[PDB]
Amino acid sequence: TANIPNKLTANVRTRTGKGASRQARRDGKVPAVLYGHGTDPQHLELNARDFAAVLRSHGTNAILTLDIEGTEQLALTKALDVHPIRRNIQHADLLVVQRGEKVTVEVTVLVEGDATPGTLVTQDANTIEIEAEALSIPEQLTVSVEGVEAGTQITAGQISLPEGVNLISDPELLVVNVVEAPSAEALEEEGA
Amino acid sequence: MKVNPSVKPICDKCRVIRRHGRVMVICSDPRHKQRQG
Amino acid sequence: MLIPRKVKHRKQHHPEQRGIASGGTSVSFGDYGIQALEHAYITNRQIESARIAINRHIKRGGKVWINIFPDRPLTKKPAETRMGSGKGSPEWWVANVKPGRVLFELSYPDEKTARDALTRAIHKLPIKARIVTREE
Amino acid sequence: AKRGRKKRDRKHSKANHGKRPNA
Amino acid sequence: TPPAAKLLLKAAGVQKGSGEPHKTKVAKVTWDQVREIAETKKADLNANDIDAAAKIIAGTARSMGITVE
RNA sequence: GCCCCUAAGCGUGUGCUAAGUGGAAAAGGAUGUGCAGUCGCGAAGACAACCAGGAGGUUGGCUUAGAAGCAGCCACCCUU
Ligand SMILES: [Mg+2]
Ligand SMILES: [Mg+2]
Ligand SMILES: [Mg+2]
Ligand SMILES: [Mg+2]
Ligand SMILES: [Mg+2]
Ligand SMILES: [Mg+2]
Ligand SMILES: [Mg+2]
Ligand SMILES: [Mg+2]
Ligand SMILES: [Mg+2]
Ligand SMILES: [Zn+2]
C-alpha cells in the first residue's frame, strides 16, 4: 500500500484573526496552519472546493503536497474544525511530514458482511489509533462480521493491519459487539 | 374530496398537481382525491 | 417517563436557550440520528412519545439511544393564583436542547425504514430537526 | 386580537429602526 | 408428483416443520435423501443435472428449516 | 424621502418576483421559479411511451376455519 500526495495550491495569509478568517471563508477559502517538527508555523489559505474534494476522495487523513510560493511541502491533515450546523470546514491543522516518518493517526473502521439472520451488529468504536508510515496510512480498515453469531465481540487486536501498520490503541477495545436482535418487548423496556 | 393543509399521495397511482394555485392530488381511486385548504 | 432519581435543587432558574451546542453534536452510538436545529425545552413526555414512535415503526431488530435526559425542573403555580407568594412547585422535566445537539440515535439494518422511523419521531418534537449519519 | 399585533409590527418601519415605545 | 416439502417431511420423519426456519432444526437429511427426492421429482423440475435438482430441493429444505448435510 | 395626493427620480446599469408577494403569522404540506454544488444512468441507445416475456420446485415453513406472492410471524433459498 502506498498513497500518492494530492496537490493543493496554498498562499501565505496577509492577515490573521477572525475578521480576516471570516472574509476568507466568504470568498471560498479555508484558513489553515502548517506546523511541523521543524517548529516553523506557517499561516495559509486553501481553496475550499479543492480541499473538500480531497477529503471526500481520500478521507480525513489525506496526504497533501502543498504549493507555497512555489515551494512544495509534504503535509498530512492533522485535524479539521467542522461547524456543527453548516457542516463546512472552518479550519485545518496540517502537519509537515517527510517520507518514511512514523505518524500516529486515527482511521475509520468500516463494517462489512451479512450477520447471522437473528443478529444486530452494534459498532462501539468508530475509530482506532494506528502507527503507520506517512505514505502507508490506510484510508479505511474493514472488519467482516460475515458469520459471527450473537455474543461475539470483535476487538481492536483482531483486525487485519497491512504491513508496516501497528496498533497503538490497546487490544482490549471493543470495535464491534454482536447481539441477538432485540424483541419488541426489549424495545419497549429500553429507555422507558 | 379531502380538504386539508397537508395533502399526500396515498397510493402509487396518486399524482400531485397544481391547479388554479391550489396543490391537489388526483387519482383513479376517488377516495384519494384531495385538495389543499 | 424519564425523571431523575433526585436533584440537589428542586426549584431552578430556567435553562438559557442561547448558543450552539458545543457537546454531543455527532452520532456516537447508532448509525443514524436526529440533530436539533432550534432551541427548545424538550419534556420527558415528548421524549417518550418520540421513542415509542421509533419503536412502533421498526417493530423489532433495532436499538434506540436517547442522548438527552430531562433533569431540569420547570415549576408551575397553582391555577387562578395572583402573582407572588413564593415560586411554584415543580411540574415539568425538560432537557435544554441547543441547535447541533443529537437527540436520538438509531441502529437498524435497513436505511429506508430507519429514516422513516426517525421522521415519525421528529413530528413529535417541538423543534425543527434533520436526520444525520455517522459519515462526513 | 389584531390591534396588539398591528401596533407592535409597525416598529419594523424604516423610520423606527425596529423599535417603538410600548413595543 | 408429490410436493417437495412433503417429501422432505417424510424423509426427515417429522409431522410439522419449524416455525422459525433459522432458529430451529426439526431434523437432518443427508444429501443422499435429497438426491433421491430430486430423481423422483425429475418430471417436475427445470434442472439439467440431478446435482442441480438436488440443490433446488435443498433450497426448499432451507426455507422450512431442515438441515442438509 | 423623490408616479399623483406631496418638496425632490414615472433616475441609470444588471438580475429576481406573478403572489398585488411587496402591503402581518406557526407546526407542516407542496413537480412554483431562479442560482450554485455533490452523485447516479445514457449514443455498448438511457428516461417516457408502445410490442413481447415476467417463470419451474411452490399452495416456501408456521399460524390459523382459511393464508395459495399480496391479515400475521420466520426465513427469503435453488434452477431454466
Ligand atoms: Mg461541554
Ligand atoms: Mg391569541
Ligand atoms: Mg412634486
Ligand atoms: Mg430608490
Ligand atoms: Mg421608466
Ligand atoms: Mg424606476
Ligand atoms: Mg429592470
Ligand atoms: Mg399583502
Ligand atoms: Mg407564512
Ligand atoms: Zn391513489
Side-chain angles (χ1 to χ4, degrees), chain A residues 55-56 60 80 83-87 89 120-124 126 181-184 187-192, chain C residues 1-2 20-21 25 27 29 35 51 55-56 58-63 65-66 99 107 109 130-132 134 136:
Chain A
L55 296 170
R56 291 179 194 127
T60 316
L80 297 170
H83 194 270
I85 294 166
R86 309 209 208 35
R87 298 137 154 223
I89 303 136
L120 178 63
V121 286
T122 307
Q123 181 172 0
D124 302 317
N126 303 358
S183 65
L187 277 181
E188 290 178 338
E189 291 188 319
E190 282 196 46
Chain C
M1 293 233 287
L2 302 181
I20 293 159
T25 61
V27 180
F29 309 89
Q35 184 177 50
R51 80 168 272 277
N55 289 349
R56 297 286 170 273
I58 69 184
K59 293 179 179 179
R60 62 180 295 275
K63 191 169 176 74
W65 296 260
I66 312 173
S107 66
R130 65 180 180 205
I131 297 164
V132 171
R134 264 180 159 143
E136 178 179 313

Side-chain angles (χ1 to χ4, degrees), chain A residues 5-17:
Chain A
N6 311 102
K7 311 197 171 184
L8 294 170
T9 171
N11 40 267
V12 175
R13 290 176 83 198
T14 305
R15 291 188 182 181
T16 276

Side-chain angles (χ1 to χ4, degrees), chain E residues 8-65:
Chain E
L8 284 165
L9 288 182
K10 73 184 292 167
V14 176
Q15 291 292 350
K16 281 194 174 184
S18 307
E20 285 261 356
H22 72 302
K23 278 192 217 189
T24 326
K25 293 179 179 179
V26 277
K28 294 179 179 179
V29 170
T30 61
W31 280 113
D32 296 339
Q33 286 157 316
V34 182
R35 285 166 185 131
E36 289 183 32
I37 299 175
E39 286 197 358
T40 57
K41 287 244 61 167
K42 188 173 182 182
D44 198 28
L45 291 172
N46 285 349
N48 289 32
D49 286 331
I50 301 89
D51 301 352
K55 204 181 176 185
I56 293 168
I57 302 295
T60 315
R62 183 174 182 160
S63 58
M64 75 195 295

Side-chain angles (χ1 to χ4, degrees), chain A:
Chain A
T1 302
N3 294 281
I4 69 178
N6 311 102
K7 311 197 171 184
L8 294 170
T9 171
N11 40 267
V12 175
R13 290 176 83 198
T14 305
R15 291 188 182 181
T16 276
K18 71 180 183 292
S21 302
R22 289 174 182 184
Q23 186 62 21
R25 293 181 198 113
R26 197 175 297 139
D27 211 27
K29 299 185 183 181
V30 53
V33 63
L34 184 67
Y35 56 81
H37 48 264
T39 322
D40 41 358
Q42 301 189 62
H43 307 311
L44 305 178
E45 306 174 323
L46 317 174
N47 183 34
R49 287 191 191 190
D50 303 337
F51 186 61
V54 175
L55 296 170
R56 291 179 194 127
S57 62
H58 298 298
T60 316
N61 309 295
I63 185 79
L64 327 166
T65 187
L66 303 175
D67 207 330
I68 309 156
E69 204 185 355
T71 305
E72 298 179 48
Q73 178 58 62
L74 198 72
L76 161 74
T77 304
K78 185 56 167 176
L80 297 170
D81 301 2
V82 176
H83 194 270
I85 294 166
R86 309 209 208 35
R87 298 137 154 223
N88 84 98
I89 303 136
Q90 295 192 289
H91 177 77
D93 289 0
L94 304 177
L95 184 74
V96 332
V97 206
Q98 53 194 8
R99 297 181 195 241
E101 181 82 23
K102 293 305 189 177
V103 192
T104 296
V105 167
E106 281 167 43
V107 305
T108 298
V109 176
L110 275 66
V111 179
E112 283 192 354
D114 294 346
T116 44
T119 289
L120 178 63
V121 286
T122 307
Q123 181 172 0
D124 302 317
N126 303 358
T127 258
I128 294 170
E129 187 171 55
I130 276 179
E131 205 189 21
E133 302 78 10
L135 310 179
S136 295
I137 41 179
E139 51 180 330
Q140 91 275 342
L141 289 188
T142 294
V143 63
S144 313
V145 291
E146 183 178 2
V148 293
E149 324 270 345
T152 307
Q153 297 181 20
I154 304 300
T155 77
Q158 309 188 8
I159 300 175
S160 171
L161 310 176
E163 297 189 16
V165 175
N166 207 11
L167 188 82
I168 302 171
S169 272
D170 74 82
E172 307 198 318
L173 285 180
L174 332 176
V175 179
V176 176
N177 191 24
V178 151
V179 302
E180 60 178 274
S183 65
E185 306 178 23
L187 277 181
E188 290 178 338
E189 291 188 319
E190 282 196 46

